[PDB]
Amino acid sequence: LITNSYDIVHSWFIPGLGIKLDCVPGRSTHHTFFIDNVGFYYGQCAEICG
Amino acid sequence: LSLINQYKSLNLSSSIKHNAPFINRDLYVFDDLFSYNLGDITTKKSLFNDKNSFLTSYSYLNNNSWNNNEFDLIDNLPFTTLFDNNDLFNNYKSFFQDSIFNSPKKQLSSDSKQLFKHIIYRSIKNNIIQDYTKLVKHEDFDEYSRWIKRSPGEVLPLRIIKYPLGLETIHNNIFENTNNEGNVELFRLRFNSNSSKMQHK
Amino acid sequence: MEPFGTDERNWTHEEKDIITRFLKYDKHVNLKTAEMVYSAEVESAYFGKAGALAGGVISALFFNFPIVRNLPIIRRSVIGVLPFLYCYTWGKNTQEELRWLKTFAAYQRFVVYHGQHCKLWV
Amino acid sequence: TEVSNHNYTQAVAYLNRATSSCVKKCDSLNNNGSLSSKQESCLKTCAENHAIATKIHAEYIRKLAESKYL
Amino acid sequence: DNYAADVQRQFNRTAFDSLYKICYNSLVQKNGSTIDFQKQIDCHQRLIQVFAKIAPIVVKVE
Amino acid sequence: MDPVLGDVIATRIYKACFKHVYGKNMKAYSEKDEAKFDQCLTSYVESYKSVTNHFITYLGQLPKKGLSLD
Amino acid sequence: NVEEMDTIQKMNYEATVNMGRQDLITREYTFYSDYEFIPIQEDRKQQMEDALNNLHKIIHPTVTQLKKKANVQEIQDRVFRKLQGWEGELNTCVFSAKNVRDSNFCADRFTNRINTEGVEFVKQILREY
Amino acid sequence: MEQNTTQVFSDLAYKVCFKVINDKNKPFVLHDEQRLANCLTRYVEAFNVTSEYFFRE
Amino acid sequence: EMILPHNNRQLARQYFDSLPENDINRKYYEGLKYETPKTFFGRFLNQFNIDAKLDTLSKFYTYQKTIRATQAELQEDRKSYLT
Amino acid sequence: DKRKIQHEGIIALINYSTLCAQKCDVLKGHDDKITDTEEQCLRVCAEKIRQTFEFTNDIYLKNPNLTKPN
Amino acid sequence: MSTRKIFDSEEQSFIRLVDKFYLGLSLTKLCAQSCNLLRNDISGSALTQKEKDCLSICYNNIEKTQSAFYAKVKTTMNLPAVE
Amino acid sequence: GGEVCPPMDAPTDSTLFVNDTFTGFNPDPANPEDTEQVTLTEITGIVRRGEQQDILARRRNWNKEGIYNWVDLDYMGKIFRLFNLDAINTAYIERVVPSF
Amino acid sequence: FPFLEKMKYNQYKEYKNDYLFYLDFLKKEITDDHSFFWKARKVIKLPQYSVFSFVPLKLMMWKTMINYPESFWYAASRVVQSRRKKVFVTKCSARTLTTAGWTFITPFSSNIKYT
Amino acid sequence: TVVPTQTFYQMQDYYMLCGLRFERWFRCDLVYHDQRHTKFDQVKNQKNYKTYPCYREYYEAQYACQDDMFDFLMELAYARRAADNFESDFASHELTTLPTFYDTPKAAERKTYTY
Amino acid sequence: LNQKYYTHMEHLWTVHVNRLNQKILEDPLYTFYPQELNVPKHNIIVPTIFRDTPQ
Ligand code: HEA
Ligand SMILES: [Cu+2]
Ligand SMILES: [Cu+2]
C-alpha cells in the first residue's frame, strides 16, 4: 500500500488488523500488509483531519 | 519632426506613368481601336484582366458571394452530383472544413491590402504605402499555464542521439535499434521540422 | 551572453546604452520585460533632476555662510561650487545606477527567456 | 459548418485550372471519348499534384500576407 | 456617361498590350536581352490587324 | 456560384476543343469537326469529373482534426 | 477498414489515428518571439540518413561480434563525440543560415564530413577494437 | 483592383511553379512540396527584383 | 563568425585587383616572405611603420572585427595619450 | 482614371516580370535563393524590355498612323 | 453546380462580354500560331495571300462552332435554374 | 454623438465599396464584415491654428476645475484619448457651413 | 453586514477627486444611493403591496440610531427564534478556524488554507 | 528491475528512488519519444506493435512514485521536454567529484570476468 | 604607443603576409561586412501538409 496525503497528514488505523499507516503529503509510504485471516474490519482516522 | 522630409513623392500614378513596363496610356485611338457588340452599360465596368482570375475579381465585388450556405445547400459540383456519392460529399465537406479553403472576406481584404502594399514597396518604394504608426510587438505569453509551454531558445535543427544500450535483456540482445538495412543502429539523427510550432503535452 | 569573470573587461557605457536600446525595441523582448524597462526609465530621471536641483539650492546657501561670505573671489567660487558638484554627482550616479541595475535585471529576464545562460536548466 | 459563395467560386476556378493543366499534360483530348488506363492514372496523379499545389500556393499567399502584417 | 466607350477603351488598351506581350514572347531570345524592336513593332501591327478581324466574331453578347 | 461561372467554363472548354481540333490543323469546318468537338467535350467532361473526384478526395484525405467518428 | 471493425476495434483505430495525429493539432499554436529557422530540406535529411546508414552498416560487424557492452558503449561514445562535433558545426551553420542555398551547402558539408573523415576515424577505431 | 492584381499575381506564380515542378507529372512528396514552395519564393523575389530594376534601376 | 562561400563577396580581392604592379603585398601574393626584424637597431627602424601598416590593414581588412577593434582602440588610446 | 491606369501598369509589370523570369529561368527546385548571376540576367532582360517599351512609345508617339481603327 | 443569382443582370452581361473578348484573344493567338503569322523571320507587318486565306478559314471555323459549342456545353452541364 | 450633417452618397463604382488603400475607408453600405461597417461623411471648412492661453487675454483654463478658456489641443486630445495627439496639437479646423 | 459594505459608495470615490464631470456623475438615477433595500426574508402573497419592508425592525427609526454609539451589530444578534437542534446542522462554516493541540501539527498548523 | 530498489532501500519513503526512476524514465522517453507512433506499440499496424523501449522503466517509475508526485514530476518533465535539454547538454558536475576505481580510463579492463 | 601598436601590427602584418603568400584573397573569418552587403533572411516558410504515417 502506497500511503499518501492530499492536504494534511492523515492516519488510517485499522484496529482489528492492528495497523496504523500515516499517509503524509509528499511521502509515498510503501507499507506491506499481510492479512493471515479472512474478515471485515472497520476503522477511523487516527490523525485529526479537521 | 519625423515627417520633416519623410514623404516627398505622393502622386504614385505620376510614377506609374513613368516606370511602368507598358506603352503610353494616352492613345486616343485606344478609345475606338476595335468594334464590339458592347450593348448597354449604365454603370462603370472595370476590365478584369487575366484569363484565369478575371471573374474572381467580380467575385470579390459582388456582395452575394459572401453568403454562407450549409453543406446541404451546396450539394452539387460543376460536373458531378455530390448527393449520390456519400464518400465524395464527405471529401468535399473536409475540403471545405479547412480554413485556408474557406477563408472569410475580412481576411481576404486584409490580405489584398497587405499584398498591394508589398507590391508598391517592392516595385516603386514610394514609402507612402507603408504604415504610418510604428507597432511594437510583445509576446505576452503567460508562463502560469500547465497546458501551454513555450520553448526557451529553440530546438537545434539537427541532434545526434545514441540509443540506450543494455536496456533490454529479454533475449540477451543488447542491440535494440536496427535499421531497415538490419545493421545495428548506434546513432540516430533527430531533425526539427517546424521552428514556430509548439509541442503537444 | 556577456563574459563572466573578474579578468573579463567591465561593461562599457556605450555597451550599456546599446543594450538598453535593444531591450527597448527588440522583437524578441517580452511584454513584462518591456514594461519593467519602461517603468525603470520613467522614475530614474526624477532622482537625477532632483539631485541637480538640490545641489543648486544647497550650494547657494553655502555661498552666504558666515565664513564663506568674506573670502577671496576664487576661494568663494570654489567653496560655492563644492556642494553643487557633489550633489550633481549624487543625482547622476543614482539615476544611472538605477537604470543600469534595472537594465541588468531585464537582460537577465530576457536571457532566461532566450535560454542563453549555461548551467541554467530547469 | 457553412461556406461562402466566394469560396465556392474560388474552388471552382482552382478546379478549372487544375483540370486544364491535367488535360494539357496527360493529353486527355487525344481520345475517343474514354480515357485510357494510362490517361486515367495520369489524371489522378496530376489532380493530386494540382490539389497539393493549390493548397501550397494558398498557404504561401496567406503566409506572405501574415509576414507583411506580422 | 459613356460607360460603353470607357469599357471599349479599357478593352482596346488591354488587347494592344496583350498583342505586344505576345509578340515580345515570340520574338525574345537568348534568355531575354535579344529581341528586334522593328520586328516587334511589325508583329504588334499584324497581331492588331488579326485581333481586329477576329473582334466581330467573338467579342459580342450571346 | 452563378451561371456566369458555367459560361466561363464553357468558353474555356470551347477554346480547348478548338485547340484539340484546329490547334495544328487549320482547315474547313465540317460534320467531322463537329463530331471531333463533341468527342473532345465528352473527354473534357470526364476529365473534369475525374479531376474533381481526385482533388476532393486528396483534400478530403488530408487530416485536419482528430478522428472522432462519434 | 473502420466499418469492418467492431466497437472495440474501431475505438482502437481511432486511438491510434489520434495519437499519431497529435502534431497536426500542435501545428496550430505558435509563439511569435521565437527566432524562426528555415527547416532542413527532405533531400538533405535523406542524404544524412544514408550516411548514418552507411556508418551503421560499417559498425554492424564489430558491434555484432563484440561480447562486451562496455566495449560497444566505448566505440559508440567515441563515434558519438566525433559525429557530435561535426553535427554541432553543421547545426551552427544551419541556425544562422539565411537561404536555401546556405542550407544545402551546410548539408553537403556535413554529409561529406560524415562520408570522408568519419570513415577513416571509424576504420581506425575498428582496427583498434 | 488591388484584389484583382493580387489574384493575377498569385495565378501567374501558381502557373509558373506548376509548369516547372509538374514537369515529370509524377507523385509529389514532402521534398516536392518544399521544391514548389522554393519555386514560388524564387518567382516572388524575381518579380520584385524585375519591378525594382524597371523602376529606374 | 563565418561568411558562407556562396555569400562571401571577395572585396579584399577587389582591393587586390586595384593595387599597383609594384605592390609588396603582390610580391607577398607572389610569395615574398616578410619577417619582423629581430635586430635591436633594426627593430628600432621598424618602430616608425605602425601607422602605415594600420592604413594598409584598414585598406585590406575593412570588414574584419579584429581589425576594426584594433583600429578603434588605437585611435582612442592615441587621443587619450595625447590629451 | 488613376485606378485603371495603375491597374494596367501593374498588370503590364507583372506580365513583363513573368516573361523575363521565364526567359531567365529563375525558378529551380534546388533552392529558392536567386543567384547573383540570375539577378544579373534578370536585370539585363528587364533593361532590354524597358528600352524596347521606350522605343515603341517613341515610335507610336511620333506617328499615330501605326495604330489605327481596325 | 451549387448555382445562385450573385451577379446582377448587367453584371452577367458585362461578364459574358469580357469572357467573349478573352476567348477571342486566345483564339486570335491560336490562329496566329496555326497560320505562322508569329514567325520570327517576319519581314513585315503584313499577311500574304496564304496567311489571309488561313485567317479567313480560322475565322469561319470559329464562327461555325461558337454558338453550337456554347449551347452543347450548357446542355451537358445542365446547370439548374436559380430560384 | 448627434449628427451635424447628412452623410455622403455611395459611390457608383462597386470597386469603391472597399477599404481605401491609404484612408482605409470602406464606402460599402452593406459591408460583409459588420465589424468593418463604416458610414463616412464629407465636411468642408476653414483651418484655424491652435489658440494660445493668455492671462492678459483672459484665457485661463482650469482643466482640473473643468473651466475652459483656451483652445488646448493637447488637453482635448488627453481628454478624448486621441491617437494622433501630435498631429492634433499641430493645428485645428474650424467647421464652416455654406452660409445659413 | 449590509452596513459594513463600503464598496457600495465606491463610485462616489471616483467623483471625490475628479470634479471635472462630477455634476454629470450626479445626473444619474438613484437605485441604491444612500439606500439599503433588503430582499424579502419571507413569502407574503398579499397583492395589496407592490413591495414589503424587509428592513430590520430595530433599525426602522434611524433617529434612534443617531445617538447610540454602537454599530449595526445590535440588529444582527438574537433577533429570531428559529433553532434547529440537529447534530447535522452547521454552526461554524469556518473549517479552517481550529487549533493544532499541544503539539502544533505541520503543515496543518502552518498554512492559511488548512489553519 | 532496471532501477534497483536496493539503491535507496534503507529509506522508508521512496523519495530519492522515485526521483532517480523518474530521471531515468524521462531520459529514455526523450531518447525514444518521436518514434513511438512510427516504430513502437503506438503504430497503426497492430501486427507490427513493438513494446516501447521505456515500458519497464515507466512501470518501475509508476510503482516507485505516487500519484501526486508522479503528476508534478510529469509537469516538470513536460517543461524539460519542451526545453529539449538533454542531461548531457548541461552536465559539468563530473569534474568536481573525487576519482574512483570505477572511473578508470580502460573501463573494459576494469571488469575481471571468470567462470 | 610604438611598443604596443608595433607588437600588435607586427602580428597583424605577419598574418597578412601569410595570407597573401597562400594567395588567400578572402576576408578574415571574423569579418563583419556592411548592411548593404548582407543577405536578408527569407521569412516565408510554409510547413508541409500533415499526413498520417502508414506505419
Ligand atoms: C499537566 C497537564 C495536564 C493536566 C493536569 C491534565 C488533566 C486532565 N486531562 Fe489532559 N492533556 C494534557 C495535559 C493535562 N491534562 C495535554 C498536554 C493534552 C494534549 C493536548 C493535545 O491533545 O494536543 C491533554 C489532552 C487531554 C484530552 C484529550 C481530549 C481528546 O483528545 O479527545 C482529555 C480528554 O479526556 C483530557 C482529560 C483530562 C482530565 C479529564 C484531567 C483532569 O485531571 C483535570 C483535573 C484537574 C487538574 C488535574 C488540575 C488540578 C486542580 C488544581 C486547581 C490543582 C491546584 C491545587 C494545588 C494548590 C496543588 N486531557
Ligand atoms: Cu483523517
Ligand atoms: Cu482524521
From TrEMBL, chain F:
Q: Which cysteines are joined by disulfide bonds?
A: 17-40
Superkingdom: Eukaryota
Give all N-formylmethionine modified positions.
Answer: 1
What name appears for this protein in its UniProt entry? Uncharacterized protein
From TrEMBL, chain J:
Which pairs of positions does the record mark as disulfide bonds? 20-45, 24-41
List the InterPro entries hit by this protein, alphabetically: Tim10-like_dom_sf
Q: What is this protein called?
A: Uncharacterized protein
In which organism is this protein found? Answer: Tetrahymena thermophila (strain SB210)
From TrEMBL, chain M:
Top-level taxon of origin: Eukaryota
Q: Where in the cell is it found?
A: Membrane; Mitochondrion inner membrane
Residue numbers binding Fe(II)-heme a 7:
102
- The entry's Fe(II)-heme a 2-binding residues are 102
Q: Which residues bind Fe(II)-heme a 3?
A: 102
Annotated positions binding Fe(II)-heme a 4: 102
Listed binding positions for Fe(II)-heme a 6 are 102
Residues binding Fe(II)-heme a 5 are 102
- Residues engaged in binding Fe(II)-heme a 1: 102
What the protein does?
A: Component of the cytochrome c oxidase, the last enzyme in the mitochondrial electron transport chain which drives oxidative phosphorylation. The respiratory chain contains 3 multisubunit complexes succinate dehydrogenase (complex II, CII), ubiquinol-cytochrome c oxidoreductase (cytochrome b-c1 complex, complex III, CIII) and cytochrome c oxidase (complex IV, CIV), that cooperate to transfer electrons derived from NADH and succinate to molecular oxygen, creating an electrochemical gradient over the inner membrane that drives transmembrane transport and the ATP synthase.
The entry's family comment says: Belongs to the heme-copper respiratory oxidase family.
Q: What is this protein called?
A: Cytochrome c oxidase subunit 1
Organism (species): Tetrahymena thermophila
Q: Which gene encodes it?
A: cox1
Q: Which residues of the full protein are shown?
A: 173 to 287 of 688
UniProtKB/TrEMBL annotation, chain O:
Source organism's superkingdom?
Eukaryota
Q: What is this protein called?
A: Uncharacterized protein
